[PDB]
Each structure stands twice: as C-alpha cells, then as structure tokens.
Amino acid sequence: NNRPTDERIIDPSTANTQLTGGVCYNTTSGGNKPLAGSPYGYETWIDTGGGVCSLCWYGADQGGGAAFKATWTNPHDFLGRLGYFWNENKPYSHYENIYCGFNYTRSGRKTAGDYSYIGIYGWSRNPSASNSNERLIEYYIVEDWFGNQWQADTSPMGINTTGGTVMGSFTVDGSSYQIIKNTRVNQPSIEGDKTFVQYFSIRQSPRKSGTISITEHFRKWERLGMKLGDNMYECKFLIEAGAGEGFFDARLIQFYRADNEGNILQITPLHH
C-alpha cells in the first residue's frame, strides 16, 4: 500500500487545539448509538455501582469528526468508545487500508486504576473457526495507558496486565508492538457470557498523538494465526479505565480509509 497524502488528513502532531461544546452521555448506551450527522457511533459502559462517568462527542465538524472527551470518578471498568460501527458480515480486508490520526491529553499516572487502555478497539466474529474459543474475538491496539502504582505510564503494559501469551511483535508507525493472545473464559461478551479470545498489539513506546495503521495490525495478527473471521463488528477509538479519577480529552480523532494506491475512500469531516 501507498501511504495516503490527501489535504483533508489532519497532521496529528500539531493538532492540539482544545475543543469545546461537546454532546455528553452519562449512562451506559446499551451498544452502539449512531451520532447525528456522522458516519460514526459511540458506546459507553458505565457501571451504576461506580461513580460519575461521561463521554462527550466534539461533533462532526471539528477535531477530525470522532474526537471526544471522557471523564471517570471511581468507575468500575469504564469504557468509552467512538468510531466505525460495521457488523455487516464483512472481514477486515473489505474495509481496505484503515488509519486513525489522533491527539489527546489525559490525566496522569495512576489516575485510571490497575489496568487501563487507550487506542483502537472492537470485536469480530469467526463462526467457522474449528476451535470454538476463537469464534468470537475482542481486539485492542494499545497506544498508551495510565500505568499504575507499580508500573510507569511511560512503560508498556505486558501479559501481567492483559493475561495470555506473547505471540510475536512487529514495527509500525514508529514503534515496536508486542502481539498478545489471551483467552477469556466464561466472561461477558457481545454474545453473552462465554469463552472467547482477545488480540492485543501493545505499543512499546506509548504516545498521545500520531497515526495508527490499523490494517497493518489486522494483517500481522492473521499471519500469526490469530484469525479475525468474516464479520467485523466495529473499529473505534477507546478509553478504558479500571478505576481511579481521571480524564481523556481528544483534540483529534480522525478515521480514514484508503485503497492500495493511497486514494481516500472515506474521511471525516465531509473556499477559504
């Protein structure tokens, strides 16, 4: 593939103007909810047994179209996410070359509990997999996290946080990523409580701005035998906080998709 060079792509490294005027959601959404005037949808998971959480979308016309701010006050595994919702019986390759340009600020080390994740997230279904455990996939491309009492937020998380097995690694978008496969045994999922697999790419050098070549991760996982199947559910930008009191505030979240030649097939947002 040729890296896309289109003038609509916002340079992440200098996309650092604070956004205002969000539309905020304070409760669990019960799945994907489409956003007004936008190709994207959001999802919130906010436990009523924890404290106040919110996700505020910055709208269709600024910050690349998918930017949001999230806050949590002593959550129990807050997840706020926003981006592509698919679920139309297609494998990842149907969506061509997927990218996400991003720039955010966040609260510091130890403001999000013992585990936390920032990056790209979703699910995929693979019903024809011979191993029943691999028929449902939850996936993460982890650009950053909040560390914890024991480990700096500048140090990449490993299998003591994610669980599972290091499968390999590769280098893309300026860092090595460690690839991890984990099995979740009888755990909540988009298909009810069951056994399913998780795929992780962990950025070895955490960062708060840049471009994620999402498709490159999908390709690498499949080469290692971590198959995604033929029904991709979604592809969204996530903040997940196990606990703590913190925030995440994006100045840019811009998804776009291109052909192999580097022509833009989809970008947001849609004279001087």
User: Domain boundaries in the chain?
Assistant: 1-272
Instruction: Specify the residue for token string 């708060």.
Output: 208
Positions marked catalytic: 138, 240
- CA 18, CA 104: separation in Å to the nearest integer? 9
Host H or E run for residue 217: helix 214-223
Q: Which method resolved this structure?
A: X-ray
- CA 77, CA 95: separation in Å to the nearest integer? 30
Which of 22, 20, 74, 17 lies closest to 48 in space, CA to CA? 74
- Half-sphere exposure (Cβ direction) of 169: Cα atoms closer than 13 Å: 10
C-beta neighbour count of 258 within 10 angstroms: 23
Contact residues for 239 (Cβ-Cβ < 8 A; gap 6+): 70, 78, 79, 80, 81, 106, 116, 117, 118, 248
Asked if 54 and 29 count as a contact pair (C-beta separation under 8 A), the reply is no
Host H or E run for residue 247: strand 245-258
Cis peptide before 127 (omega within 30 of 0): no
**Resolution reading in Å:** 1.6
14, burial (CB in 10 Å: exposed 0-12, middle 13-18, buried 19+) = exposed
Tokens of 19: 């956004």
SS3 14: helix
- Half-sphere exposure (Cβ direction) of 256: Cα atoms closer than 13 Å: 25
Q: DSSP assignment of 153-210, as one string?
A: TTSPP-HHHH-SEEEEEEEETTEEEEEEEEEEEEE--BTBSEEEEEEEEEESS--SEE
Percent helix, strand and coil across the chain, each to the nearest 5: 10, 45, 45
Length of the chain: 272
Handedness of CA 231, 202, 96, 45 (dihedral sign): positive
Contact residues for 222 (Cβ-Cβ < 8 A; gap 6+): 228
From residue 30, give the alpha-carbon distance in Å to each of 27, 44, 88, 192. 9, 8, 19, 13
- CA 72, CA 101: separation in Å to the nearest integer? 24
